[PDB]
Antibody, heavy 205, light 215 residues
């Protein structure tokens, strides 16, 4: 198979520059007339094509971006780059790299995406509160920034995060049989990579 | 070139037909080839290509997806729709630079009505220690999405400080879930005793009432 993995600073302050990398595995980015595109998706799901670089190093931009974005490659690392400066909050989005279809200008293989948040706000790790009374358990995750938390439990719903005076709140529930808990241990591990924090809250009766 | 997609959302029963239209601004057909493409996107995932050049099915995509149209009018047909089809569908043209995308059409699946499973939770002692008091109600695995949740403190209804959040339609069972959070200061929370979240939903004439006492 062919996999594309994006990486880059999640939180960048306005004005400054975002630099993203797309590492390709399973095919060479110099092979067989393929083109590689960058595509972003804004909150609210609008999609915007940004530009492409071909297997032979030809680059074409979206004309509304050409003044402030650069696409390059490092073939010895099988990587493609996206640089963009003069940043506003309008540039907060999920940034994808994609291999174009064989006939070009449509997008057949996508990376998992990497979100960039353009904000002046400080990074803040979450507080995690257990929600204890089949039986439903939960964890409330409050007061973190930027967005990007994942909950895992040692039957699960993840409710979307709500913004409130600069800080996000979300919650997650899990359902288990009433013989299982509190006999067995249930724990919600919450990860917030922007603050490099993990909270493993055990649910107590 | 701008593409307009109708409708904004579509509700379809299992096995039925889903029809999605994409209206361009100019012709995008070269008398033979048409420069139209369709994608499927599920929440938390990148778009997936379904159809390229108006009518060609991508490898590994089921034949339940059919693309059609020419000039300015393009159609995606999903026949029959399955439960895994709940997603947002996008059209995209490759006629000039830049390629541009429709705004998307949300496809929701119709299923049999299901009552919510309701749970209420007091604030944790850890939250109370740090000064705040969130009372949380979960309403899980229900259908249709329409639901009414009201909070009563000591028998009387309340409105200020309630925040609701909905999941997307679950791709496995087509149900919805929601969280309802009643935010209060510790002081306010301590000077009251009974807390109740009441769910009204079309699946029952009587509401679902979950409560706890601060003792």
């Amino acid at each position: 198979d062919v996999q594309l993995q994006e990486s880059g600073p999640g939180l960048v302050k306005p004005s400054q520059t975002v630099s993203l990398t797309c590492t390709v595995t399973g095919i060479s980015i110099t092979t067989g007339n393929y083109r590689w595109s960058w595509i972003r998706q804004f909150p609210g799901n609008k999609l915007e094509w940004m530009g492409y670089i071909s297997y032979s190093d030809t680059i074409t931009y979206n004309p509304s971006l050409t003044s402030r974005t650069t696409i390059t490659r490092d073939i010895s690392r099988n990587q493609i780059f996206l640089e963009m400066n003069s940043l506003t909050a309008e540039d907060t989005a999920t940034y994808y790299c994609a291999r174009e279809g064989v006939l070009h200008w449509y997008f057949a293989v996508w990376g998992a995406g990497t979100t960039v948040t353009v904000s002046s706000a400080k990074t803040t790790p979450p507080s995690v509160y257990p929600l204890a009374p089949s039986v439903t358990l939960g964890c409330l995750v409050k007061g973190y920034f930027p967005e990007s938390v994942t909950v895992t439990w040692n039957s699960v719903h993840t409710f979307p995060a709500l913004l409130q005076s600069g800080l996000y709140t979300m919650s997650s529930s899990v359902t288990v049989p009433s013989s299982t808990w509190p006999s067995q241990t249930v724990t919600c591990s919450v990860a917030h990579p922007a603050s490099s924090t993990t909270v493993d809250k055990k649910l107590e009766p | 070139i701008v593409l307009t997609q109708s409708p904004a959302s579509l509700v379809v029963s299992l096995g039925q037909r889903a029809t999605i239209s994409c209206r361009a601004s100019q012709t995008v057909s070269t008398s033979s080839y048409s420069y139209m493409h369709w994608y499927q996107q599920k929440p938390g995932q990148p778009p997936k290509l379904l159809i390229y050049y108006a009518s060609n099915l991508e490898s590994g995509v089921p034949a339940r997806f059919t693309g059609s149209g020419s000039g300015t009018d393009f159609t995606l047909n999903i026949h029959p729709v399955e439960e895994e089809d709940t997603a947002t569908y996008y059209c995209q043209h490759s006629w000039d630079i830049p390629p541009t995308f429709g705004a998307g059409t949300k496809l929701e699946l119709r299923r049999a009505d299901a009552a919510p499973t309701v749970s209420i939770f007091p604030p944790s002692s850890e939250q109370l220690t740090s000064g705040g008091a969130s009372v949380v109600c979960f309403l899980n695995n229900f259908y249709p999405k329409d639901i009414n949740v009201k909070w009563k403190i000591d028998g009387s209804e309340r409105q200020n400080g309630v925040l609701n959040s909905w999941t997307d339609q679950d791709s496995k069972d087509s149900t919805y879930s929601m969280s309802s959070t009643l935010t209060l200061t510790k002081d306010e929370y301590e000077r009251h005793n009974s807390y109740t979240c009441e769910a009204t939903h079309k699946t029952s004439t009587s509401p679902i009432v979950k409560s706890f006492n601060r003792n």
